[PDB]
Structure formats: C-alpha cells, structure tokens
C-alpha cells in the first residue's frame, strides 16, 4: 500500500503541522505568563527587602525601648521545523528566568522565616515589659 | 528517504528540550508551594507583631 | 634579523597592488629586501618589500590578493623578520603558473599570446619572491587575471620559494 | 520498487511516532504553567499585603520610641 | 549537644510551676524554652537519619508549643513531624497531618489546609492503601480550592477523585466528576487543549450502563475534522461504541490496537479498555 | 480630597519645627507625613491620568522621603515617578531612573539596579536614540547580572550590546561579544539550540574582513546536517561566503532571497546583509 | 567613600570592649557597626571590579557578623562572598560556601543547605576537578532533597551523581543509582517519557560483566513495540548487547554510527560507548 502509506503518514504530518502550531500558541501563553510571573515577583522581592529593613529597625527600637505533493509536504514540515525557532525563543529565556527567580525565591523564603523568628523573640521580650 | 530522515530527527531533538521544560517547570511548582507555606506562616506572626508592637506603644509612649 | 612587531594595513594605491609587493615605510626597510610574515606557528609566508611615503613607520601594507593568500588582517599584530635568499639555490629559472580570469565580469574566448605575457611578467615582477601556491594579479593589456604558482625550479632542483631574476623563463 | 517505497514508509511512521509523543509534553506544559500561575497569585497576594501590615507595624514601632 | 540530654532538660522544664518555683507569675517562656529544646533534638535526629526519633521529637515540641499560645508555628512543627514520619520507617505521618489541618482549618487557613490535605489523601493511597478515605480527602480538599477560586488545584484534586473512582468500580460518579471538571474548563481557553481527554475518559467510564450514555456524550462533544487534537479523543470512541452495540470483541480489540499507533495508551486507559472488553465478551458467553 | 490642598498642606508640614511646636523632638514623623501626603496626591493625579502632576508629586514625596533617611522606600518612589513620566507626557523619565539607580547602587542592591538599568538603556534607545549611552548601560548591567551568576539576564543584555554594536559599525566588537556569549553558552546544555544564531550573527558581522574569519567561525561550529537545527545557521553562511569569495553580487542576493524562505529575515539581518551586498559590489570594481 | 578608610575604622571597632570602654555593657552594638563597615567596603570593591578585595571583605564582615549572634544574615553574607570569589580571579569560593552550609545545616535549614550543596559540588567539579568530593556532595544533597520528599530535585542530583560516577569507572554503582531513580520515577506518570534514558544508561554502564545484567535490564524494561519514545532506548541496546557478547568492534561502532543519525549522541554516551568499544578490542586484539 504505497499511496496508502505515503499519504497516511503524510496525513499525520499535516495533523502534525498544526500540532506544533497549537503547542506553539499554547507555549506563547507560557511566554506571556512566565513573563507576568517574573514581574509579579520583582515586587515580592521589593516587599521582601522592605520587611528585612523594617524588622532590623523594629528590633533595634525594641532594645532602645527595653532600657508538488512532497513540495508542500516539506513546506508543512518546514513550518514544523521553523517553529523550533519559536520553541527556542521559549525554553531558553524562561528556562533561565527560572534559575534567577528560584535562586531568588529561596532568599525570599529564608528571610521570610527569619523575620518570623525575630518577631517571636521581640514579642517575648516585650510581654515581660508590657502595661 | 532524503527529506524523510531529514525531518525525522529534526523533532527527535525537539523532544529533548521539552523533557527539560516539563521538569524545570515542575521543580518550580514545588518550590513556590514551599514559599506559600512560609510567606503566609510569616504574616501569621505579623498579626502578633502588630498587636505586640502596639502593647509596647501603650507602655513607653 | 630576530624579528619585530608590525601592523598589517591596506595597500596604498593600485600601482602597488599590481606588483605583488608588501608596501612598507622608508624609515624601516628599503626597496629590494625580503621578509617573512609570521602570523601562526603553522603559517609562514615570504613577501617582497617596496617603500612608500603613505606607509606608517612600524607597519606593513598588503594587497587584497596577498591578504587572501597569506591571510592577513588589517590591524592585527604580525611578526616580520628580514629574510635573505640564497641566490645560489633559490634563483628561479623555470616556473609554471596557473592563469584564470580573476573577474567574472570580463570573461571572453579570444586567444592570448603567451610569449607577450612571459615577457611582460619578468619585466614587472623582476627581483621578487614567489612561493608555490602564491596568489596574485596580472595586468595584461588592461586585463586582470588570477595567477597561481604551481612549480618552481632553480637555475634542475625544485624549490618552494624562489627569487625571480632577469633570465627567468615562465610558463 | 516496493523495497524502496516501503522503506520510506517505515521511516515516516517512526517519525510520526516520536512526534505526537513530544507534542504531548507541550500540552502538559501549558497545563502545568497554568496551575502554577494561579498558585503564585495567592503567593504574591499574601506576601504583598503581608508587607502592608508590617509596613504599618514598623511605622508604629518607630513612633513608639520617640 | 546530645539529643537525649536535651529531651531530658526539656521535660525538666515543661511543667506548670507553682509554690516556690512559680513566685508570682507562671512562665510561657518555660514551655517555649522546652519547645526549642525538643526542636534542637529532632534536628540532630534527622541529621543522623534516625527519623523515628526526630518525628516523635517534633511531636513533643509541637504539643508543647500549643500549651504556649502559638498555634501557627506549632502547626508548622506538626508538618515537620509529618515530613519526618513520612520519609521515616514508622507511621504517625497521618496523625501529625490531621493534627496540622485541625489547626490550619480552625485558624482560618484553608489554602494551606488543602495543601496538606491533598498530601494526606496521597499518603492514605500510596502508603496505607485506603482509597475509600483518600478520595474523601481529595474531594473535601478540592472543595477548599474551589472556594479560593483556584480552579487549577481544585481540578487537579477532582481528577484524582474521579481517576481513582473509576478504578474503584465507581464509573458513574467518575463521569459526573469529568462532566463538572469539563464544564468548568471550557470557560478558560487555557484548558481547551486538554479538554478532550476528559470527554474521552468520561465516555469510556460505564456504570454498566446498558445504552449510549457515551454515544450521547460523544456527540455532545464539539469535535472538528480539521481539529487534529480532537482526532485523539472521540474519533476512536465512536468506533468503540459501535463495537460494543454489536457484541463484537474483535472490532474493539482491533480498534484499540490501531489507536495504540497514533496515540499511546497509558496504564489507565488500558485497564478500563480491558474492563469494557470484558463487558463485551461477558455479554457474549454470558 | 483635592490634590492642590494636599500638596499645600504637605508644604506646611515639610519643615523642621521650632519653639514649643518642636519641643524636644521634631522627629522625621513630619517629613514622612508630608511624603504620605504628596503620595496621596500623586495618586489621584495618576487616576485622573494627569501623569505629569502625578510624577512630579512622586518626585516631591520621594525627595522628602530622602529627608527622612530611608533610601530604599524612597528609591522605589523614584521608580513610581519614573513609571509615571515614562508613560506620561513630559520627560524626567530618564532623571528619575538615574536617581533610582544611584540609590540601589550605593545601597548595595545591584540585582534591582540592573533591573532598572536595562529599562534605562531601553528607553535611552527606543526614545532618546542615544545608542552610545544605551550600549554602555546594557553592558554595565550585563556585568551586574553576570556577577549575580544569573547567566540568563546577563546574556539577555549582552545580546542587546552586540546587536546594537553591529549597527554602530562595531562589527568586530560584535563578533567578539558573540564569541564570549557563545563560550559561556556551550557549558550549559540548555543553550545548545540558540548557540546557532550566535554563530550566524558573528559570521555575518564583518569588520571589513578579507580572510576566512567567517569560514573559520563556521568551521568552529560543529554542524552535522542530521543536527538539523543548524540548517537555520551556517548552511546559508557557507553559501554567502562562496558568493562573497566569488564577488558575485547575484548569488548572494539570490541566497538571501532563498533563505528568506526557510527562515525569515528580521530587521537586523536585512540591514547587515545589504552592507555585505555592498562590500561585494565595491570589490567588483576593485 | 574610601574602602581602605572603612576597613581600617572597622578594624578599630571590631574588638571586644575592655577597661572603661566595656564598663557595664559592650559587644553586639560595636561588632555590628564593623560588619556594616566591611559590607560597605566590599561593595565599592565590587563596583571597582576588584572582586578579590570585595570577597575577602565580605569574609571579614561575615565572620564578625557571627561574632555577634545572628547566624542567618551571616551565612547569607558568606553567600555574597562566594558569589564574589566565584566571579573573581582567586579561589576561596569553596571555603565561603562550606562556611555557609555549616550554618544552614546546624541551623536546621536543610532545604537551602542542599540548594547551595549542589552549587558547591558544581564548583568542586568544574573547577577543582575534585570529583570524589563533588559526588559526595551531590549525594548527601540528594539525600536532603529526598528528606524533604522533594523527589524531582533529589533526582536531578542523583542523575548528577550517577552521571559522573560512570565517568570515574564506577559503572556498577551507577547502574544501581539508575535503578533507584527509575523505581522512584514511575510512580508519577509525568515522568513516563523520562523513564527511558534511565534504562538506556543503566544498561550501558558495565562493571566489566561477562554477559547479561544489561541483557537482564533491557528485559526488565517494559516497552510497547509500536512505541515512539522507547525507540530511543532499548531497541538500540539489544543490538549493542549482541555486538558486545560477540567480540565485534565493527557491529557496535557501526550501530552507534547509525543511531547517531536519528538521535545525536551527547559527550557522556560517546565517552562510555567508546569505553565499551575499547573493552571489545581489548578482548579482541589480545
């Protein structure tokens, strides 16, 4: 079944062209979404460096307070191959946008638990000298 | 066989990056969830800090 | 002798681009000496010097052809050293050259007398150094060609580098 | 010759194969990036405001030592 | 720096004072001091990887913390204990987490309650092997996520619920879950893609329904010839629906064999497909 | 309610107290109050979309906030002012940002300093068209990102630097940047794909080269048609090197006509390809 | 402004008080001041691009910060010092990090302890070439990730371990690691795809066995012939096994020559394939 295999396998490459096309658009959302996520985190760090300071002051203030069939076929596949150019524009950028953030997230979790502790201590030392 | 083998692995190579994408994207999911349990647990104490900092206000101010 | 740092530049004019000679300054070398351009441990080339006022003291200028053959950059740092030929074993007497239309814009099918070529070749490229596989330009009747040294024989020993003299036969 | 037309075939299917499976990873990805998106919305939120409440806490401590 | 020594000091100080030791005021700093002690011990226990000694240690520190007046960080300790027991050799991991959720829940923290709730149902399944309760948790948790308008997690959980529900004969309750998770999926063109598999699963699930419960749910689907993503969902289903309405356990077993060429069959599908294969054979020689 | 009223009162209170009003401690609580005022005004201005007024107001609150001694929260305000002026009507967009970086920088926060540093070069390019200063920023910023071992962003900047370097005739200085950003890209198997485009750009960027600098860069590039991605990189390059070495301004112009079929040509490529197209013509008359 | 000036002042103040200087209290309040000084110095040393000085300065600020009691911010300072020496020209990048982990470790912050633990082994390998210690780190770190039940991360590390374990001739110890990371990757259907390469690697690693193991590993592998991903795993392996059992360094190096067309080989594979190619010849030309 020559024509039955050169067309079915081709019929898939066609249902394949859109596939990577559909996944490319779906990937674009990952681009715009991972871009939005990167932004919404720039403010998180901002609020993380904001708490870091205030706490240091507060703590100190408390001490101071305590004391043509194949021609098209190829074109359809070529489009699938060209999409890699877009598939590349994704995995890369965001892929790295992942490291920068994660390494930043950890620094956010730590200080997040750090301030928490200094709050428990400050409260304890404060209770003993309350009204 | 020309264009065939040509377009053959052309994708087998794109099958790798996703293997990296699916993973690097899932590793984040768990890390963020970890921050969700600490960041909140933090403000949870802030509710105490505010009240505690206020009690100190009625003693030295 | 030992060697000195130099800077490759561009050929002054066309008059010196049709001589296949590394143009230099007068405060450095003299028209008639030979040197050996040293760029890489595996890249050795020999050129013929020709002073010119436009040249800058401490630099050597080459022509596009040579700049494509020996591979030289206009700005990079090369190590030039005085090379003295052995006119007792390097003097060229019989040298074969591969000729072909340099430009594709001027390609015809008319006949060209070789006798008139070998006569005008030695009359212009006299007292100069040529190496096996060297590239250059030849202006014959206002027509540019792309020569290519194939074999060189001293006056019947074979040499890689020689010095074209007067009684030098060319094929 | 079938020996040549059949060879092409086996190569295309085996090509179609590796394909669809890879594409599967693209889909799951968009599905993963989404779930994560909604989860970060709650993260930032609780954090952002967490800074607002503390911003008021520190402002009071500063005025509680003067 | 000895754990045993710390555990002893901790016990020595964890006690409501009275008489001469009290003086005038009690001392929450005491109970908390003991907490820090036990925590310090549980840590080195986890260091040497004794887990069984770390977990039970955290529990102590955790319990004491409650005796203080700090439910928050306490619950987090219960989590540390659960994480210990989990990655440990004994159990208790289930008790700690229940003791954690009672806190996050009564505290007004449902986001986090559900975060550990799903973990719980994941344990009661991958470990204790008690799906009947696991599903119950996957559900209540999906309800909490559904409250925080966090469609995502809510659906993840629902998917777990139905997914294992089909494996527990609960085929109808499964399609129902698939219908809900399918309706609240189209609204967002972000799930349009995966929205197929849901219809395929649902149509495959059969509560011994002797009809076209699926043939009615197959046409309800909005497939499109040009849509190639769809060719990986109902196109097969129709062919399976005919193979069942004609008790032909050959056209079905062949169509699944062919479909396993364009779209690989995961473990799930396989299991259910064979279940239908049996409903057919079984209706032949039955 | 009125911004004018707030802006005025803010002025009344923004002044070191004296006499009985000052008592013993005038404190910075007043300068800060004024800050909150101007911010409250800049706010309604930003609502009314007056921007201009909003920005200048933020500048006021910011400056005063500096008189408070709290650089951080101030700089952030300078950023607010920047975001205002930027997407506003007047200028100052550049000023605020410079006044922001001087703070993040002296403070020791290079991570965020580079964040606004790139925004700066981006405005100084897409607006002021001050390429020479923009490159200086894209570069210094890339240095900071490189320090934070945030390879990512660092490369996102270097690409800018080189990309806009070729436009300023800096072809060699461009290829070098591509070489560095390439070498520090092979060490990571997560940049294997993109590594192509780099070699394509570098091989295209010609500082009036005559040798085979590109033939050598293309040789350095490990290609194997079976590693198909490469097709969108050097396969064309070689053809271009041939049409160049053969002073054929027809084959090169045909190749750029064909490649524009398998891989579209963005602005950059176009401009440069035309520059090479001229190097050939100018060589034809040689 | 001047670093030398600050470093000197910092020195003059960094010293436990005594005599009339100590009086009643003295310590933290001073040592901290010095910390802020050195940090301010290391900052300008970093803007000046001297790094070395910046790093040593951070080392000072950090050490002093420990002399005050505040281990957290201190450890983070050591991290800053590490980033400094790292992007710098001297060493010490290894010491700063060890001094950071000792802290995050005995503190109870294992999650991050492992975060920097993998960075450490990543430097101890790419630079110091100290593979034995690097592996000891990738391993202990994976143990911590496994502790937090953070499977994925633990696997990333294990993959590193095994990967470099096979390079150090430790082939058997590698196949085992691939086994474990394999049985702990099928529980999650999100790793289905991934489960292949593991079996291919584990079957390639040979502890100089005289047959099976690999023939047994390929057997344990569950493949579905009409599969697509799996084509890049066992199918080849079988051919390699036959080419090994039967001394024929012509059927092995050929099959790898063909396979290198439909699935480009990475440095790792090549290294090991050649090692096997050598075992064959070393059994042949013997």
UniProtKB/Swiss-Prot annotation, chain B:
GO cellular component, one term: clathrin-coated vesicle
Signal sequence annotation: none
Expression sites (tissue/organ): Nervous system specific. A higher level expression is seen in the brain as compared to the spinal cord. Expressed in hippocampal neurons.
Cytoplasmic side: 1-61
Location of this chain's protein in the cell: Cytoplasmic vesicle, Secretory vesicle, Synaptic vesicle membrane; Cell membrane
UniProt KW keywords: Acetylation, Cell membrane, Coiled coil, Cytoplasmic vesicle, Membrane, Phosphoprotein, Synapse, Transmembrane, Transmembrane helix
Domain v-SNARE coiled-coil homology: 3-61
Protein's membrane topology: Single-pass type IV membrane protein
GO molecular function annotations of the record: calcium-dependent protein binding; calmodulin binding; identical protein binding; lipid binding; molecular adaptor activity; myosin binding; phospholipid binding; protein-containing complex binding
GO biological process: calcium-ion regulated exocytosis; cellular response to insulin stimulus; eosinophil degranulation; establishment of localization in cell; exocytic insertion of neurotransmitter receptor to postsynaptic membrane; Golgi to plasma membrane protein transport; hormone secretion; long-term synaptic potentiation
Site description (Microbial infection) Cleavage, residues in chain: 30-32, 38-39, 48-49, 53-54
PTM characteristics: Phosphorylated by PRKCZ in vitro and this phosphorylation is increased in the presence of WDFY2. (Microbial infection) Targeted and hydrolyzed by C.botulinum neurotoxin type B (BoNT/B, botB) which hydrolyzes the 76-Gln-|-Phe-77 bond and inhibits neurotransmitter release.
Natural source organism: Rattus norvegicus
From Swiss-Prot, chain C:
UniProt KW Protease keyword: no
UniProt-annotated location(s): Cytoplasm
Keywords: Acetylation, ATP-binding, Cytoplasm, Hydrolase, Magnesium, Metal-binding, Nucleotide-binding, Phosphoprotein, Protein transport, Repeat, Transport
Gene Ontology cellular component terms for the protein in this record: cytosol; Golgi stack; midbody; plasma membrane
Membrane spanning stretches: none
Disulfide-linked positions: none
Residue ranges of coiled coil: none
GO molecular function: ATP binding; ATP hydrolysis activity; ATP-dependent protein disaggregase activity; identical protein binding; ionotropic glutamate receptor binding; metal ion binding; PDZ domain binding; protein kinase binding
Protein's name in the database: Vesicle-fusing ATPase
UniProtKB/Swiss-Prot annotation, chain D:
Post-translational modification: Phosphorylated by CK2. (Microbial infection) Targeted and hydrolyzed by C.botulinum neurotoxin type C (BoNT/C), which hydrolyzes the 253-Lys-|-Ala-254 bond. Cleavage inhibits neurotransmitter release.
Tissue: Expressed predominantly in cerebral cortex, hippocampus, cerebellum, adrenal medulla and retina with weak expression detected in non-neuronal tissues.
Covalent link Glycyl lysine isopeptide (Lys-Gly) (interchain with G-Cter in SUMO), residues: 62-63, 66
GO molecular function, one term: SNAP receptor activity
Site ((Microbial infection) Cleavage): 63-64
A Gene Ontology term for the protein's cellular component: synaptobrevin 2-SNAP-25-syntaxin-1a complex
Protein localization: Cytoplasmic vesicle, Secretory vesicle, Synaptic vesicle membrane; Cell membrane; Synapse, Synaptosome
Keywords: Cell membrane, Coiled coil, Cytoplasmic vesicle, Exocytosis, Isopeptide bond, Membrane, Neurotransmitter transport, Phosphoprotein, Synapse, Synaptosome, Transmembrane, Transmembrane helix, Transport, Ubl conjugation
Keyword Membrane: yes
Predominant cellular place of this UniProt entry's protein: membrane
Top-level taxon in the UniProt lineage: Eukaryota
Family of the protein in this entry: Belongs to the syntaxin family.
Protein name from the UniProt record: Syntaxin-1A
Species: Rattus norvegicus (Rat)
UniProt gene name: Stx1a
Full protein stretch here: 191 to 256 of 288
Swiss-Prot record, chains E, F, G:
One Pfam entry name: SNAP
Full protein name: Alpha-soluble NSF attachment protein
Species, as recorded: Rattus norvegicus
SUPFAM superfamilies reported in the protein's UniProt record: TPR-like
Primary location group: membrane
GO cellular component terms, semicolon-separated: glutamatergic synapse; neuromuscular junction; postsynapse; presynapse; presynaptic active zone membrane; synaptobrevin 2-SNAP-25-syntaxin-1a complex; terminal bouton
PANTHER family the UniProt entry points to: ALPHA-SOLUBLE NSF ATTACHMENT PROTEIN (PTHR13768:SF23), SOLUBLE NSF ATTACHMENT PROTEIN SNAP (PTHR13768)
Keywords, alphabetical: Acetylation, Cell membrane, ER-Golgi transport, Membrane, Phosphoprotein, Protein transport, Transport
Top-rank taxon, per record: Eukaryota
Subunit (UniProt): Interacts with PRKCABP, and disrupts the interaction between GRIA2 and PRKCABP, leading to the internalization of GRIA2. Found in a complex with VAMP8. Component of a SNARE-like complex that contains at least ZW10, USE1L, RINT1, STX18 and NAPA/SNAP-alpha. Interacts with VTI1A. Interacts with STX12. Interacts with GNA12 (via N-terminus); the interaction promotes CDH5 localization to plasma membrane.
This protein's record includes keyword Protein transport: yes
Phosphoserine PTM sites in chain numbering: 19, 22, 188
InterPro entries named in the record: NSF_attach (IPR000744), TPR-like_helical_dom_sf (IPR011990)
């Amino acid at each position: 079944r020559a024509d039955q295999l050169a067309d079915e396998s081709l019929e898939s490459t066609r249902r394949m062209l859109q596939l990577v096309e559909e996944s490319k658009d779906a990937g674009i959302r990952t681009l715009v979404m991972l871009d939005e996520q990167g932004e919404q985190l720039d403010r998180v760090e901002e609020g993380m460096n904001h708490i870091n300071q205030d706490m240091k002051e507060a703590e100190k203030n408390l001490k101071d307070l305590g004391k043509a069939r194949e021609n098209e076929m190829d074109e359809n596949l070529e489009q699938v191959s060209g999409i890699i150019g877009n598939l590349r524009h994704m995995a890369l950028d965001m892929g790295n946008e992942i490291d920068t953030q994660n390494r930043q997230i950890d620094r956010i979790m730590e200080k997040a638990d750090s301030n928490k502790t200094r709050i428990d201590e400050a409260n304890q030392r404060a209770t003993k000298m309350l009204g | 066989n020309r264009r065939l083998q040509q377009t053959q692995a052309q994708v087998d190579e794109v099958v790798d990056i996703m293997r990296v994408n699916v993973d690097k994207v899932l590793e984040r999911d768990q890390k963020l969830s970890e921050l969700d349990d600490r960041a909140d647990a933090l403000q949870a104490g802030a509710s105490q800090f505010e009240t505690s900092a206020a009690k100190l206000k009625r003693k030295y101010w | 002798m030992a060697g000195r740092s130099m800077q490759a530049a561009r050929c002054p004019t066309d008059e010196l681009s049709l001589s296949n000679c590394a143009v230099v300054s007068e405060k450095d070398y003299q028209s008639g000496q030979h040197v050996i351009v040293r760029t890489s441990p595996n890249h050795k080339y020999i050129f013929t010097l020709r002073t010119h006022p436009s040249v800058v003291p401490g630099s050597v200028a080459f022509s596009l052809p040579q700049r494509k053959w020996a591979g030289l950059s206009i700005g990079q740092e090369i190590e030039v050293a005085l090379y003295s030929f052995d006119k007792a074993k390097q003097c060229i007497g019989t040298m074969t050259i591969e000729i072909d239309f340099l430009q594709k814009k001027n390609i015809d099918s008319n006949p060209y007398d070789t006798d008139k070529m070998a006569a005008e070749f030695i009359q212009q490229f006299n007292n100069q150094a040529f190496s096996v596989g060297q590239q250059l330009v030849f202006s014959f009747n206002d027509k540019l060609f792309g020569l290519l040294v194939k074999d060189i024989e001293a006056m019947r020993q074979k040499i890689e580098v020689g010095l074209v003299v007067g009684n030098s036969q060319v094929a | 010759a079938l020996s040549e037309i059949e060879t092409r075939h086996s190569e295309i299917i085996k090509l179609e194969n590796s394909i669809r499976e890879l594409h599967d990873m693209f889909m799951d990805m968009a599905m993963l990036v989404e779930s994560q998106g909604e989860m970060i919305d709650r993260i930032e939120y609780n954090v952002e405001h967490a800074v607002d409440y503390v911003e008021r806490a520190v402002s009071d401590t500063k005025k509680a030592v003067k | 720096a000895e754990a045993m020594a710390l555990l002893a000091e901790a016990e020595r100080k964890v006690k409501n004072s009275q008489s001469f030791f009290s003086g005038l005021f009690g001392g929450s700093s005491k109970i908390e001091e003991a907490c820090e002690i036990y925590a310090r011990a549980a840590n080195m226990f986890k260091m040497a990887k004794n887990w069984s000694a770390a977990g039970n240690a955290f529990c102590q520190a955790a319990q004491l913390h409650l005796q203080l007046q700090s439910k928050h960080d306490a619950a987090t300790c219960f989590v540390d204990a659960g994480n210990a027991f989990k990655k440990a050799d004994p159990q208790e991991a289930i008790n700690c987490l229940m003791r954690a959720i009672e806190i996050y829940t009564d505290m007004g923290r449902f986001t986090i309650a559900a975060k550990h709730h799903i973990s719980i149902a994941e344990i009661y399944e991958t470990e204790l092997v008690d799906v009947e309760k696991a599903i119950a948790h996957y559900e209540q948790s999906a309800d909490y996520y559904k409250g925080e308008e966090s469609n995502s997690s809510a659906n993840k959980c629902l998917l777990k619920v139905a997914g294992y529900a089909a494996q527990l004969e609960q085929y109808q309750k499964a399609i129902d879950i698939y219908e809900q998770v399918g309706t609240s999926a189209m609204d967002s063109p972000l799930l349009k893609y995966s929205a197929k598999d849901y219809f395929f699963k649902a149509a495959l699930c059969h509560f011994c329904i002797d009809m076209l419960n699926a043939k009615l749910a197959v046409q309800k689907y909005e497939e499109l010839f040009p849509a190639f993503s769809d060719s990986r969902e109902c196109k097969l289903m129709k062919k399976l629906l005919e193979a069942h309405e004609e008790q032909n356990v050959d056209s079905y077993t062949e169509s699944v064999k062919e479909y396993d060429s364009i779209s690989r069959l995961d473990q799930w599908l396989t299991t259910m497909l064979l279940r239908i294969k049996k409903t057919i054979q079984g209706d032949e020689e039955d």
